[PDB]
Design a protein around this ligand. Structure first.
Ligand SMILES: COC(=O)Nc1ccc2c(c1)NC(=O)[C@H](C)CCC[C@H](N1CCC(c3c(F)ccc(Cl)c3F)=CC1=O)c1cc-2ccn1
Length: 238
């Protein structure tokens, strides 16, 4: 996260850190708890991931230093990537991780509500992007989970900012015209969480942008409300 500040423990209890153990263990991407065996994240996170066996999901983490060999984690049973996904810039950048065991909810780890299909017309004015990503173009994964408040940008304005791309209604953009605050490397797959009527909703999934926090280059997020039926199809299968 560029231009953010340290989060307080328990502030974003749906936020997870997804680690890979191959070739060595490291943070790969962010993700959000949406159900007791389900993590919602970005499809592009899994480029070259040949098996869910190399993955570890850590919940209730503020600092990456809380993670050692003896730290508990959730194994991944299945990686579900949207069938239309080709690359982040073309959309459908969404994936589900089915966990091997159930998450016990508490004050350190609990799910975030998905947006309502009836709330496609609501205007979110209190949106935040979180993660352990870079704070600048050439940096490293941060120890402390960072947060930054960012305004949503209309599809029309985001399209003007990305001349050679097609910004679809399955994408949602966020950023300041002057830049300064944005997601960066290591934040992808994490949430864009918006508070509406005292309830937090998972509005976006950190997906891509041209560089980080540049003037007139908003962050591009998977527009979660457009995938609510896809999520339910995969998580509520008979
Ligand atoms: C010590 O352990 C490490 O060092 N780990 C480490 C280090 C670096 C990386 C990664 C892990 N993970 C990856 O490689 C995976 C496979 C994801 C690949 C894409 C990812 N991006 C690109 C787009 C993006 C973005 C933006 F820039 C602006 C705005 C918005 Cl909305 C965005 F979504 C954010 C972002 O996280 C990214 C992560 C890394 C390296 C390069 N890119």
């Amino acid at each position: 996260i560029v231009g953010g500040t340290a989060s307080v423990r328990g502030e974003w209890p749906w936020q997870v850190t997804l680690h890979t153990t191959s070739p060595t263990q490291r943070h790969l991407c962010g993700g959000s708890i949406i159900g007791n065996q389900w993590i919602l994240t970005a499809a592009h996170c899994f480029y070259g991931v040949e098996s869910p066996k190399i993955l570890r999901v850590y919940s209730g983490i503020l600092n990456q230093s809380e993670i050692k060999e003896d730290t508990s984690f959730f194994g991944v049973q299945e990686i579900i990537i949207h069938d239309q996904y080709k690359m982040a810039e073309s959309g459908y950048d969404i994936a589900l991780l089915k966990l091997e065991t159930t998450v016990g909810y508490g004050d350190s780890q609990r799910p975030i509500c998905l947006p309502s299909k009836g709330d496609r017309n609501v205007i979110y004015t209190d949106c935040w992007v979180t993660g352990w990503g870079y704070r600048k173009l050439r940096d490293k994964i941060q120890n402390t989970l960072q947060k930054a408040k960012i305004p949503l940008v209309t599809n029309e304005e985001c399209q003007k900012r990305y001349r050679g791309h097609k910004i679809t209604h399955k994408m949602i953009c966020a950023g300041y015209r002057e830049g300064g605050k944005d997601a960066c490397k290591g934040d992808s797959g994490g949430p864009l969480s918006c508070k509406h009527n005292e309830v937090w909703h998972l509005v976006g999934i950190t997906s891509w942008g041209e560089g980080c926090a540049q003037r007139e280059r908003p962050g591009v997020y998977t527009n979660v409300v457009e995938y609510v039926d896809w999520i339910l199809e995969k998580t509520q299968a008979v």
